[PDB]
Structure formats: structure tokens, C-alpha cells
Amino acid sequence: LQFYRNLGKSGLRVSCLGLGTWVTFGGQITDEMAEHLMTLAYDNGINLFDTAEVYAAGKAEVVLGNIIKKKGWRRSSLVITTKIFWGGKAETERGLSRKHIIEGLKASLERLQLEYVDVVFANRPDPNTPMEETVRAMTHVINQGMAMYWGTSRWSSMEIMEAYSVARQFNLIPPICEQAEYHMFQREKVEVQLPELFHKIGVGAMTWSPLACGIVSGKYDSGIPPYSRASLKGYQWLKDKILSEEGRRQQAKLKELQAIAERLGCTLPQLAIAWCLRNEGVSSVLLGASNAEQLMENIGAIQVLPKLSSSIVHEIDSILGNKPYS
Amino acid sequence: LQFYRNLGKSGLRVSCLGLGTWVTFGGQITDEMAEHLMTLAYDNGINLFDTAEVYAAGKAEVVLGNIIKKKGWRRSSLVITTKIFWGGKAETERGLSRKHIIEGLKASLERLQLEYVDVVFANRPDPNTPMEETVRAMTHVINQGMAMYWGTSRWSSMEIMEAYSVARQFNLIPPICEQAEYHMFQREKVEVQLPELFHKIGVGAMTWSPLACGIVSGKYDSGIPPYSRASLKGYQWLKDKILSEEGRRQQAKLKELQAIAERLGCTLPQLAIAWCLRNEGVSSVLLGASNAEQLMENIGAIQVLPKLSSSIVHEIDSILGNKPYS
Amino acid sequence: SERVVINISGLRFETQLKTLAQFPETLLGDPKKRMRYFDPLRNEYFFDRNRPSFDAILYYYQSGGRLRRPVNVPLDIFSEEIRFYELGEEAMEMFREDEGYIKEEERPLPENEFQRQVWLLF
Amino acid sequence: SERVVINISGLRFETQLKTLAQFPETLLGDPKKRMRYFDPLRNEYFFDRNRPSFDAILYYYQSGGRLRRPVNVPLDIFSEEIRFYELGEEAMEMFREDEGYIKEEERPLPENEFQRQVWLLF
Numbered sequence: 001l002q003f004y005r006n007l008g009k010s011g012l013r014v015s016c017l018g019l020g021t022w023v024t025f026g027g028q029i030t031d032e033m034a035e036h037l038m039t040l041a042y043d044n045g046i047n048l049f050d051t052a053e054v055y056a057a058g059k060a061e062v063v064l065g066n067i068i069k070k071k072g073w074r075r076s077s078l079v080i081t082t083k084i085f086w087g088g089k090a091e092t093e094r095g096l097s098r099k100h101i102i103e104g105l106k107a108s109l110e111r112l113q114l115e116y117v118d119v120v121f122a123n124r125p126d127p128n129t130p131m132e133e134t135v136r137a138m139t140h141v142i143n144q145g146m147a148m149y150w151g152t153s154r155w156s157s158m159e160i161m162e163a164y165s166v167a168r169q170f171n172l173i174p175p176i177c178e179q180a181e182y183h184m185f186q187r188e189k190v191e192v193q194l195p196e197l198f199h200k201i202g203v204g205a206m207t208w209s210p211l212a213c214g215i216v217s218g219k220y221d222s223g224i225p226p227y228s229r230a231s232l233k234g235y236q237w238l239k240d241k242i243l244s245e246e247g248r249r250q251q252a253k254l255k256e257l258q259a260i261a262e263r264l265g266c267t268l269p270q271l272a273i274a275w276c277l278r279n280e281g282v283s284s285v286l287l288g289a290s291n292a293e294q295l296m297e298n299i300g301a302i303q304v305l306p307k308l309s310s311s312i313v314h315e316i317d318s319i320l321g322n323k324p325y326s
Numbered sequence: 327l328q329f330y331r332n333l334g335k336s337g338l339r340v341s342c343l344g345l346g347t348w349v350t351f352g353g354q355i356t357d358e359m360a361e362h363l364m365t366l367a368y369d370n371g372i373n374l375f376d377t378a379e380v381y382a383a384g385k386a387e388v389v390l391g392n393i394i395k396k397k398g399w400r401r402s403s404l405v406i407t408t409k410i411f412w413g414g415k416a417e418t419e420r421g422l423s424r425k426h427i428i429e430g431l432k433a434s435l436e437r438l439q440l441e442y443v444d445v446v447f448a449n450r451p452d453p454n455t456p457m458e459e460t461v462r463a464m465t466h467v468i469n470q471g472m473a474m475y476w477g478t479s480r481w482s483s484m485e486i487m488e489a490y491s492v493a494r495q496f497n498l499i500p501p502i503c504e505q506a507e508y509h510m511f512q513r514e515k516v517e518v519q520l521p522e523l524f525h526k527i528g529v530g531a532m533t534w535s536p537l538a539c540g541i542v543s544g545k546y547d548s549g550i551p552p553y554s555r556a557s558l559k560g561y562q563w564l565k566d567k568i569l570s571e572e573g574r575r576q577q578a579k580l581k582e583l584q585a586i587a588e589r590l591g592c593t594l595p596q597l598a599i600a601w602c603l604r605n606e607g608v609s610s611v612l613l614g615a616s617n618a619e620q621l622m623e624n625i626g627a628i629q630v631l632p633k634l635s636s637s638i639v640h641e642i643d644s645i646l647g648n649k650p651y652s
Numbered sequence: 653s654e655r656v657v658i659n660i661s662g663l664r665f666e667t668q669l670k671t672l673a674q675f676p677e678t679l680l681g682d683p684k685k686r687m688r689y690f691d692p693l694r695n696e697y698f699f700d701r702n703r704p705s706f707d708a709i710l711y712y713y714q715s716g717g718r719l720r721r722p723v724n725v726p727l728d729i730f731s732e733e734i735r736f737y738e739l740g741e742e743a744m745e746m747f748r749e750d751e752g753y754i755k756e757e758e759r760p761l762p763e764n765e766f767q768r769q770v771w772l773l774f
Numbered sequence: 775s776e777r778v779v780i781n782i783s784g785l786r787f788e789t790q791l792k793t794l795a796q797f798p799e800t801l802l803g804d805p806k807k808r809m810r811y812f813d814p815l816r817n818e819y820f821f822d823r824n825r826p827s828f829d830a831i832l833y834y835y836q837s838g839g840r841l842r843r844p845v846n847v848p849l850d851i852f853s854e855e856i857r858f859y860e861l862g863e864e865a866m867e868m869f870r871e872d873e874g875y876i877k878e879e880e881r882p883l884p885e886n887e888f889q890r891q892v893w894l895l896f
């Protein structure tokens with residue numbers, strides 16, 4: 001019901017829906033279309049935009065920054081986030097070492113033409129770097145005014161808790177958010193492992209791929225449409241998933257969900273996105289969109305949210321047959 | 327008797343009277359008149375000037391800074407303070423999150439054309455932001471040289487103590503002052519709750535609206551004068567208070583106080599302001615003034631202060647009938 | 653092997669999480685039950701309780717079951733603490749026995765309204 | 775539930791402020807009386823006193839009234855501490871009694887200058 005919410009228990013307020021830039025910005029869509037998606041999103045109250053040094057080899061950040069600069073939006077009305085881990089071919093250009101966090105964030109900031117991001121994320125865990133080093137580097141970039149906060153992405157709850165305890169031990173800053181994959185076909189981490197962290201140390205979840213890259217939209221009920229992400233050069237892996245035996249099973253379950261959507265008077269994408277927001281532990285869902293129609297439809301997920309009663313949720317669980325055991 | 331005093335137990339020395347800029351600067355009065363008030367104040371030893379990002383949508387800071395720059399006063403001879411909380415229409419432009427404290431203070435500094443303020447204040451408590459985050463942000467702006475000290479405004483003693491303990495816990499900087507409303511018709515907080523904090527952790531009070539926006543001046547004994555704050559567009563709420571049943575009761579009590587004023591040989595505004603300074607816990611009183619006459623009269627409150635004997639104080643208490651129970 | 657810090661009225665205790673997970677039905681061994689006492693600012697669980705007793709409570713987990721009352725702690729205060737930490741009825745019984753307390757029975761009347769009446773005055 | 779740290783000659787104790795406010799007439803329960811011992815640099819009240827005794831003093835507040843002298847602390851040192859923390863005459867009496875001390879009376883003469891004189895040598 002509340003459009004805006006705290007990111008975890010931090011004081012940072014984000015819209016429950018954000019717009020990501022993976023695959024699209026500087027890649028699948030034109031800069032004109034990217035400017036159009038961002039404008040539409042911003043005019044509709046969405047204040048959260050997520051990107052990463054790895055998207056399109058840095059061009060996603062360049063396009064995102066070009067739009068923010070061209071539109072003149074007040075920096076204080078935006079929450080920009082970026083992720084660091086894979087920043088180049090050289091050995092020292094990847095990972096969460098102090099060298100790569102500082103250099104990677106500095107180069108993203110340059111591509112974004114911004115003095116800082118609101119949240120910097122470790123795009124994934126790093127077995128080769130001591131937690132202390134990572135936590136001190138993140139704390140460093142925040143004290144240098146290069147970021148306001150930091151978070152983790154694809155880390156286990158054990159690793160997130162280690163960062164938090166290392167932070168308390170050395171008087172550093174703990175992470176405030178974990179960026180986890182979450183949709184009807186990937187529920188374990190967000191529903192079973194993250195809640196304890198939310199209540200115990202205030203870490204919130206900012207989930208991605210709420211439509212499992214388009215799979216949950218229903219658009220793949222009769223094969224791979226032209227110009228769909230599954231048909232892009234470089235995304236054969238996605239095509240393989242859809243046509244696989246498991247892919248077929250998913251599509252069949254989606255036909256069952258459509259009836260739920262009609263009962264709630266909404267489209268499947270709207271239902272799928274609202275479902276991700278039914279529990280408090282999720283602070284925001286990062287959407288993906290290759291055109292304006294998709295974005296305008298997906299934003300409507302907010303009207304569905306109040307209708308997800310325990311009854312409806314139990315039903316979706318029955319259909320999916322994959323509710324994780326607590 | 328001592329014109330200057332320590333702000334709480336910090337080493338910052340302020341005049342017992344300061345000049346505020348709410349309603350007036352960039353709003354009710356001309357920049358010419360604002361330059362005139364500030365000059366008069368500075369030439370009379372007043373070194374404290376208070377403003378806020380919210381006053382006149384930022385114009386109060388612009389006018390205050392224009393005067394300081396034009397007069398060429400040595401920055402080291404001034405104590406400039408500003409308040410942060412409401413800095414815009416966007417969701418992320420209000421509150422005490424790290425994002426808004428840094429961005430809000432940075433934008434005020436730009437409007438003030440100053441490298442830093444002496445004291446930055448949280449204009450009010452923030453239920454939506456962990457104390458730790460706020461205290462780390464305030465400590466951050468001080469370490470960045472953006473402020474010399476920080477304080478609270480409209481916080482309860484419980485919240486002030488929480489900031490102090492959070493500061494000790496993480497080796498951060500505690501607040502040194504609370505900006506509380508204080509006048510003959512609003513005494514609870516300053517007389518009952520703040521003294522313990524003054525003696526225990528050194529936090530001092532810097533009170534505002536010592537004339538309850540003009541109500542205590544006596545100027546409203548026969549209705550709402552023209553050009554008075556109560557008659558300004560946007561201040562109907564003040565007009566409502568004056569004419570209300572409670573307003574009438576206040577005005578009647580003011581007639582009783584006038585006799586006290588004459589016995590002490592002073593005007594009611596002078597008595598009201600000196601009364602605010604009778605107890606050590608109050609470091610300074612922030613005055614408001616829409617013209618030079620008012621300021622020259624109000625400054626005379628300093629001559630009254632030595633005459634407020636226990637006898638006179640007991641009398642004022644009898645008349646007001648609102649002395650709070652300790 | 654994640655570590656856990658338990659602060660007993662200022663006296664600091666530390667152990668491994670796997671040492672507490674050994675007894676899941678107790679307060680400390682159950683995440684949901686101890687959650688209430690967690691201080692996220694200091695990364696510790698805080699208990700505003702009796703100090704001399706906790707040693708033995710923690711040793712119970714480290715020893716794998718040994719619950720010995722400290723010589724300097726009154727039996728009534730200790731037993732209240734065993735109950736508070738929810739060590740369970742088995743540990744409690746083992747404790748009382750070793751402490752010199754074993755009683756149990758009572759055969760009432762068959763509830764005859766007659767037998768139970770006669771038996772009570774004889 | 776604000777916490778309070780009491781440092782007894784280096785030994786650190788912590789409790790909730792509502793645990794101390796339970797007994798307003800004692801030193802620790804009265805803001806004005808304990809103010810003198812507050813260290814604003816460390817956010818703690820410091821007492822340059824006997825260590826083994828404080829446990830029991832703090833437990834008195836946590837227990838809601840139980841004042842047991844620790845086995846390892848001499849009765850004369852403990853009683854001085856009960857007096858210092860101003861626990862009051864009731865707690866003190868309860869303490870002495872439980873400690874095995876109950877005396878009270880003395881009927882003097884009516885102050886007859888005569889009776890009181892005869893009674894004293896008989």
C-alpha cells in the first residue's frame with residue numbers, strides 16, 4: 001500500500017519498484033528509448049535506478065548518466081546504485097579487493113558523470129578476498145563521499161552476517177541491503193534465508209529479474225517471439241531454459257496462473273511483480289523493460305498488491321508447488 | 327551578566343542573544359532591511375545567526391550569505407548555524423538519512439556561499455532513520471569540514487541521550503546543543519527535561535520564539551495590527567491562536583506582566599527575552615525581528631537580566647500560573 | 653564457525669554458534685527465541701540477569717549436558733535460571749536428583765465418592 | 775529501554791534503567807544521587823569500591839528485592855556497601871534477620887530520678 005519504503009532498516013527511502021539497465025541500456029535498446037523509459041519511470045514516482053560496471057562493458061552507465069545530465073533532475077531526488085566486481089580483462093580488474101572496489105567505483109562514477117552513487121554493491125561474493133578488506137574498502141568509499149551506502153549481491157546469509165560482524169568488530173559500516181534474484185521460480189533465499197537478517201541486523205532485499213528475464217510474462221507460451229530477449233545474440237542460454245523440459249513445465253504452470261491474474265483483474269506480469277512485494281522483507285523490485293508499453297504495464301503491479309490475500313497466496317503456492325520449507 | 331557564553335559545555339562561545347531568519351529573510355522583509363538588522367546585530371556583539379534549508383524555500387540562506395559576503399566580516403568572528411530536514415518535494419529530500427544530511431548541508435552551504443557552518447542541526451527527530459545512521463552522517467560532515475559541531479531540534483531528552491550513547495558506542499561525535507522552543511507560554515521541556523542533560527552530558531539549549539512569534543510582545547492587546555506577522559498571508563494559524571479563547575487568556579496575563587515590566591523599568595519584550603536567559607541551562611536565545619526598532623529594543627533585554635530576583639521570578643510564576651512541576 | 657557473544661548484565665561470554673545449536677529447544681539454541689535479546693549495535697545478545705549462574709549454563713552446552721550448580725549460587729536462584737534459559741524438564745530432573753531431590757508419587761482414591769472419602773480420614 | 779553501565783573499580787556491570795527506577799530512594803535509583811558518579815566520556819557511572827559485593831547489590835534490583843550476601847564477602851564489608859548504595863532500613867533489617875540477627879528492646883526507667891536509679895543497681 002505504501003509506494004515508498006525504507007531500504008532495509010536504513011534511512012534511505014526507495015520506491016517499491018526500481019528500473020534496472022541490464023541487457024537494455026547501451027545494448028538492446030536505443031538511447032532514445034532509454035531516455036523514454038527513464039522519464040516515464042521518474043514521472044511515475046520511481047526514484048531507484050540500478051546499473052553495474054559489467055553491463056554492456058560500461059555503456060549502460062554511460063547511457064544512464066547521459067540521461068540524468070540531459071534531464072537536469074535534482075540529484076537529491078534520485079537513488080542511483082551500481083555494482084562492482086567484473087571491471088576488465090586484467091587480473092586486478094575483478095573481485096572485491098580494495099584496489100578493485102576503489103578503482104571500479106571511481107571509473108563507474110566517471111562513466112555516470114556523478115560525484116557518487118547512493119548504494120554501491122559487491123556484484124557477487126569474493127572467496128579470494130578477506131571480508132575485512134572488502135568491508136574496509138566499502139567503508140572507505142563511503143567516507144570519501146563516493147557512495148552513501150553499500151550492499152551485497154548473491155551473497156549467502158552467512159557471508160552477509162560475516163560482513164556485519166566484521167563491521168562491528170572494526171567500527172566500520174555494515175551493508176544495508178542484499179540484491180537477490182527473486183521470482184515465482186526462485187524463492188529459497190528471499191523467503192527462507194533473508195528474513196532472519198532483516199529482523200536481526202536490518203538488511204533488506206532488493207530483488208532482481210522478477211519476470212525471470214521475461215519467462216514469467218507469459219510471452220513464451222508458443223515459442224520464442226522475434227526481438228524477445230530469448231532471441232538476442234548472446235542469450236542462447238535463456239533460449240535453452242525456455243525450450244527445455246523444465247522450461248515447458250514452467251510455461252504450463254503459467255497457464256494455470258493466468259486464471260489467478262483474471263480473478264484479480266490484472267495481467268500476469270503485474271501479478272508476478274506484485275507477488276514479489278507481498279512480504280515486508282523485500283524493499284524494492286528492480287524491473288527490466290525493453291519498451292515503454294512494458295514499463296507502463298508493469299508499474300500497474302502496485303494496484304494488485306492489496307489483493308494478494310492469504311487465500312490467493314496459498315493458491316499460487318499450490319500451482320507452483322515450490323514453496324520452500326522454512 | 328556575561329554577554330557571551332559557552333554553547334552547552336562545548337568550547338564554542340556565543341552571544342546570549344542571536345538573530346534568526348525565519349519568516350523575515352527572503353520573505354517578509356527586504357534584503358536591504360535584512361542587511362540592516364544583521365549589521366546592527368553584529369555591531370552590538372551578537373555573533374550568532376540561525377537559518378534553515380526550509381525558510382522561504384532556501385532564500386533565507388541566500389540573503390544571509392549575500393550579506394556576510396558583502397560586509398566582508400571575518401568568518402572566524404561569526405557563528406552561523408543552519409538546520410536540515412525538509413529540503414524538497416522528493417521523497418529522498420527530507421529526513422535525517424545520511425543521503426539527506428550530506429546533500430541538504432551541501433546545498434545550504436552553496437546557498438550561503440560558505441565552506442561550512444559552525445553548527446548543523448537536525449531540524450526535528452526522524453522516526454524513519456536509525457540513530458546510528460544520523461549520528462554517523464553528522465560526524466561525517468564535521469570530519470569533512472562542512473560543520474564544526476552539530477545539534478538537535480525538537481528532540482525529546484530520550485532521543486538526545488540516545489544520540490549521545492550511540493556516539494560513545496561507535497566513537498562518533500555527540501550533539502552539543504538542542505534548539506528548543508521557549509517562552510512564558512511553553513516551559514516544560516527547557517525547565518524540566520533539558521537541565522539534566524546539561525549537567526549530565528553537556529548539551530545546552532538554544533531557544534527559539536522567545537516572544538511566541540510576537541504574541542508575548544503585547545502588540546496584540548487590541549486585535550491584529552496591520553503588517554504584523556499574524557496578518558501575513560500564510561500565517562492564519564497564528565491569527566487563530568491569538569483570537570482563540572486561549573489567546574485571549576494569554577493577552578490578559580500579559581496585561582498583568584506589564585506591571586512587572588514597569589517595576590523593572592523595561593518593556594515587555596525585554597522582560598520576556600531576559601526571562602528566557604535567567605537559568606544557566608539556556609546558552610542563547612534566538613530573536614526574530616522585522617525591523618530595526620524591534621531589534622534595538624530587544625537587545626536591551628540584557629540590562630534586565632541582573633534584576634530577575636527570585637522574588638520577581640516567583641511573581642511572574644504566580645501570574646502565568648504555568649510553572650511546570652519538576 | 654560463527655561466534656556468538658552473550659552479555660550477562662555486563663559480564664561478557666562468547667561461544668560458537670554450533671555449541672548452542674546442539675540444544676535446539678532451549679532459549680539460546682533457538683534463533684526465534686533469542687532474537688528478542690539481540691543488540692544489533694553491539695552484535696551481542698543481552699540478558700539483564702543473574703551473573704554467577706551463567707557460567708554453568710554455558711558450560712552445560714560446552715560439556716554436552718553437564719549442569720552443575722556453582723557452589724556460590726543459591727539453589728532457588730539457579731533453578732529459576734535453568735527455567736529461564738529453557739533447558740527443559742530432563743536437565744531439570746537430572747539437576748534436582750544430583751542436588752538430592754527425588755520424589756514423585758501419590759495414589760489418590762479411585763474417585764469413588766466413597767473410597768476417596770474414607771481413605772482421606774484414615 | 776535505555777541501558778546503564780556501572781563500572782565498579784573496573785568490573786563492568788550493565789542493566790536497564792527501568793530495573794534501577796524500581797527503587798527510587800536508593801543511590802542508583804535516584805538521578806540526582808547518582809549524577810555525581812557519571813563519567814560523560816565513557817557513558818558510565820564509576821564507583822571506586824568493593825567488587826565482590828556489587829553482584830548482589832545489582833541482583834537486588836533485578837530480583838525485585840532479594841538481598842543475599844555473597845558467600846565470599848565478609849558481613850561487615852557487605853553491610854557497609856548496602857548502606858552506601860542506600861538500599862534503605864527495610865532491606866537492611868531483612869538482611870540482618872536472614873543473616874541471623876534480631877534484637878531490639880530496652881525498657882528504661884520512667885525517668886523518675888528515683889526508679890531509674892534503683893533499677894540500675896538491681
Ligand SMILES: NC(=O)c1ccc[n+]([C@@H]2O[C@H](COP(=O)([O-])OP(=O)(O)OC[C@H]3O[C@@H](n4cnc5c(N)ncnc54)[C@H](OP(=O)(O)O)[C@@H]3O)[C@@H](O)[C@H]2O)c1
Pocket residue numbers: 019020021022023024050051123153154179180207208209210211212213214215217219227228229230269286287288289290291293294295297298
Ligand atoms: N544483482 C545482480 O547480480 C543482478 C543480476 C541481473 C539483473 N539485476 C538487476 O535487475 C534488473 C531487472 O532484471 P531483468 O531485466 O532480468 O528483469 P525481468 O523483469 O525478469 O525481465 C525484464 C525483461 O522481460 C521482458 N518484459 C518485461 N515486462 C514485460 C511485459 N509486460 N511483457 C512482455 N515482456 C516483458 C523484457 O524483455 P524483452 O522485451 O527483450 O523480451 C524485459 O527486458 C536489471 O536490469 C538489473 O538492474 C541484478
Ligand SMILES: NC(=O)c1ccc[n+]([C@@H]2O[C@H](COP(=O)([O-])OP(=O)(O)OC[C@H]3O[C@@H](n4cnc5c(N)ncnc54)[C@H](OP(=O)(O)O)[C@@H]3O)[C@@H](O)[C@H]2O)c1
Pocket residue numbers: 345346347348349350376377449479480505506533534535536537538539540541543545553554555556595612613614615616617619620621623624
Ligand atoms: N529550531 C526550530 O525548529 C525553530 C523554529 C522556529 C524558529 N526558530 C529560530 O528562532 C528564531 C526566532 O523565532 P521567532 O521569529 O518566532 O521569534 P520571536 O521573538 O518569538 O518573534 C519575533 C517576531 O515578533 C515580532 N517582534 C519582535 N520584537 C518585537 C518588538 N519589540 N515589538 C513588536 N513586535 C516584535 C516581529 O514580528 P512582526 O514584526 O512581523 O509582528 C518578529 O518577527 C527564528 O528566526 C529561527 O532562527 C527555530
